[PDB]
Amino acid sequence: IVFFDEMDSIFRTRGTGVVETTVVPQLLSEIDGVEGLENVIVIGASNREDMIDPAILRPGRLDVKIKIERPDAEAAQDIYSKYLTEFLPVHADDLAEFDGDRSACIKAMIEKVVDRMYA
């Protein structure tokens, strides 16, 4: 798996320059040549998809596009749970309200902060 990060730096486009202009041709040729191999996979990430020229994004080479949307309330709760782990120390005042039930206290706190943020 080859990971091309920040595809805005290179492979963006050749028309707007205001050799870097000779990067995408041979890369497209090499990708077309390696397409026949079954196990070779190319992965790319970019913040700005508009700067990338559609020639590399035509059906064929870059046939799959995946959009990562901004999190919503449920996604925010899941992300908070991914970090607010039970291993972090919890003050006795909040913990006593749940009779030592760490998981219940943590999940209630996660729901409360998610509701506070999206209000």
Place this chain on the structure above:
Amino acid sequence: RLTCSPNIDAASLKKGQTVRLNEALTVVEAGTFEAVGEISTLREILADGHRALVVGHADEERVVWLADPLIPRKLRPGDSLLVDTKAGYAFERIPKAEVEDLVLE
């Protein structure tokens, strides 16, 4: 400016053909054409039909006479030719495959 030995035929010699010398500086034999050296991209063929303008590896352009085998098939701009800058001769054409035509169509 060397003199030709009576053994060899002066008219039989071809332009750009490598020749053999000796301690008396007399050409007694003529060999084949050189097969190793710099490769230059052809830019254009001059009006005289005997000299061509090519570009070197370092973007340095030169005017060099063409060898006898180069004087169907027609030479075209973009072809790669074996050259000798010191002697100012192009001896052979090195075939190259272009992928641009395949990509475009």
